[PDB]
Design a protein around this ligand. Structure first.
Ligand SMILES: [Cl-]
Ligand SMILES: [Cl-]
Ligand code: NA
Lengths: 384, 385
């Protein structure tokens, strides 16, 4: 039983799916997390931190070293230069930075624009704030997807306070082009919006796609809360070391909510993640490479089975269409999948506003070991 | 910088104090966390968990061993039986349990009763849910503090929907008596309240005080969310393994909000805390005896200096009054203390509704290393004139 505005979101298919798969013994290609660990020296650092007494509340905004390391990484990678003392806030994952940014910054009654299909937490967070979700779908292009900038512009109203942008994009694996980003900036500037970007896949762009933080576009620095995380970057989704970066005033509204949601967390992980950020670029590049190969590996397998596979330019997900196999209901496809076939995936319906080809798509995860991907493919092959 | 309703809460003094004292080398008796670590075997199990790959999202409601261990501990200590599958939710500390329980169960426009002085997160969490706090103060009872059940009853209106109780109590160190708990129960039932109880100091009761979980009282099991944490119980406030326990439908409401605030956290700590709950009762008992001895030392030292020290029956906090020393402004006293005296503490004004004893009290922490605690007392001794 839950408050009225959270009722639509009281359960997710994500948990019903991972629990089902877990003791069907179904290969889980629905999971939002990796099989493999982060950098060995990062794991060791976290172990040494516990052993060395780093087990109490860290400073409210995050340890100084971790805040410096985040600013140093954003500067190193992208040339955006944040002040670690006032413009960087460590959070309990990107998940908390998202929740706190909306609760801290968006007044009840305001509209928040979402790009559809959207990550699972955006709508309920907007609803928790008492704000109104307005969704603008991506459009196919032809094997991938693209922003429809005119559609986004039309969606803005005087009630729009904020826009949440997620690139590289979960679930489609789209990577917003500079042109798309420039169009988003023009709109955000013209309407005087706050923009919250969700960049947790910043390290995962494939095939000459390039991650270009929106905060770097004209007019954007002063109005963007940029969110990312160690979760996927360093394969430590269970550590929940994320961060929001932006203008001190906006970071203060984020901190204003955040400090009462968790206060702080992840004490021994903060020095370990700071170390990873400072030192593990080469490991991250090898991760990205390993995932590009696994993407190709899964795509090739789905394709040989007879799925119509869409391009993925980043993240560790790709979307595929089972219509060529004879499966026209993808929510029912995925529902039946573990018991019929012994694989789990997520239907695209999970990421879409309840009232285009979207309803047919399935999201598959490829951050699994080689062998597991292969086994998934073998199991799925019975559909042919 | 911030939405209207959180503006009063945008900054805490718990921030400006921590940092003032940290880097002028003032002994910090304002802190809300211990100097020392939890059970060695719990620390090692967390390190082992990291080394063993336990680094990814745990299950949405907490790992099964942890939920089982919470239910086993609540049974073992209180004889209360929760179903670990449906009636136990692991959260990101008690703090997130509180936030998610209010956001998940309390409708905008509701009144939420709070007992003043109150923990820092209650008021802003109520505001974030679009609800209205109604505050009822404790009253002096000799050297200690008491619930005024009549004031509490009178504070209920047709729009009251929830009540947050914290016992053992931060900041006074009061521990609600069965008589007080039973009076809360009557009120909650009569007004059909959801009650959230913050029991993070469940292990820290002293002398003849007893911790009696409110969920145990008449008509309460069906309307109560009981919250606690490994934070203080096992000296790991940075690990944020908290939990909420209660009827399946209320817990689902907590989970509904919680799963979008953090989703989950603390992966390698969950097996470690499960272990500590299952096996480290002896260590927790010694910790409690150890903190009783540090309380008595602090109280004796403040008293000898010339503070009027109040009774404390639990938590690792005690309250004292510096008026007999000649300090009639305790917010100012605390502001100047780190520079003047080399010690930091929190004034009671930081726990009161910004709308008489309270304004003069100062909360001191005694979960300090013994010698650190002695140094603080030593430092405070300059105030004897
Ligand atoms: Cl371009
Ligand atoms: Cl009694
Ligand atoms: Na506008």
């Amino acid at each position: 039983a839950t408050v009225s505005r959270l009722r639509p979101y009281a359960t997710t298919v994500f948990a019903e799916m991972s629990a089902l798969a877990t003791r069907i013994g179904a290969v889980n290609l629905g999971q939002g997390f990796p099989d493999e660990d982060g950098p060995p020296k990062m794991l060791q650092a976290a172990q040494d931190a516990i052993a060395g007494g780093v087990n109490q509340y860290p400073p409210g905004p995050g340890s100084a070293p971790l805040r410096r390391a985040i600013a140093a990484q954003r500067r190193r990678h992208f040339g955006v230069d944040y002040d670690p003392e006032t413009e960087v806030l460590v959070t309990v994952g990107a998940t908390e930075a998202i929740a706190a940014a909306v609760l801290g910054l968006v007044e009840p009654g305001s509209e928040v624009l979402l790009i559809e299909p959207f990550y699972d937490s955006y709508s309920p967070v907007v609803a928790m704030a008492g704000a109104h979700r307005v969704t603008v779908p991506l459009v196919p292009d032809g094997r991938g997807f693209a922003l429809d900038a005119d559609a986004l512009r039309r969606a803005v109203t005087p009630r729009t306070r904020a826009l949440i942008i997620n690139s590289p994009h979960n679930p489609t694996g789209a990577v917003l082009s500079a042109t798309e980003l420039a169009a988003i900036a023009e709109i955000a500037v013209a309407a005087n919006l706050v923009v919250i970007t969700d960049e947790v896949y910043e390290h995962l762009v494939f095939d000459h796609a390039r991650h270009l933080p929106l905060a770097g576009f004209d007019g954007m620095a002063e109005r963007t809360i940029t969110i990312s995380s160690a979760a996927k970057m360093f394969n430590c989704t269970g550590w929940k070391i994320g961060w929001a970066c932006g203008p001190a005033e906006l970071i203060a509204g984020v901190r204003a909510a955040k400090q009462y949601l968790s206060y702080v967390g992840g004490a021994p992980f903060q020095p370990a993640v700071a170390l990873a950020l400072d030192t593990e670029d080469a490991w991250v590049a090898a991760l990205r490479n390993s995932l590009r190969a696994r993407r190709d590996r899964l795509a090739a397998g789905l394709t040989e089975i007879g799925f119509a596979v869409h391009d993925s330019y980043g993240t560790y997900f790709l979307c595929a269409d089972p219509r060529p196999l004879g499966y026209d209901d993808s929510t029912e496809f995925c529902a039946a999948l573990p018991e019929k076939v012994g694989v789990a995936a997520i239907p695209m319906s999970a990421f879409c506003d309840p009232a285009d080809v979207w309803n047919h798509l399935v999201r598959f995860t490829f951050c699994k070991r080689d062998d597991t991907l292969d086994e998934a493919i073998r199991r799925l092959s019975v559909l042919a």
